[PDB]
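Assemble and predict.
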Amino acid sequence: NLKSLWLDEEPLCPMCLIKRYYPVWIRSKTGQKIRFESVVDVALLYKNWRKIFDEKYGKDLVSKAREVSEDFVKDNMLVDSDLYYSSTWESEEKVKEVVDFLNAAYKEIGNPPKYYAILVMDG
DNA sequence: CCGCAAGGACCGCATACTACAA
């Protein structure tokens, strides 16, 4: 029941609530927000994969995405960048149209990068 | 009747050399 009360079934303590709120606070305080929101956004920078895809298939994908659900599209973009992966859509007929489209693009411009790097440095 | 009575080249090369979902 606690899980159902929270977004993404993810219960939060007071400190992590602050953590989730903090980006919108900085947004209102500075007008600024980090350009790459999730690790997937960073991952898809690999060989400009997302940029190449969006130019070639970006418009069509967002159209089919909203056809499945309006909650998948925000500001003419996918609500989550993991929707560039076919497996995300798999885990009904409108969904199959997306996966076939994604797989077609992969054979053309390559599979999307699924790995990213964490860099920590210290003197 | 007698004698001789193998030698080097090549020497595994290339391709494929994870894909994908659950």
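Residues 25 and 31 of chain A are 9 Å apart (CA to CA).
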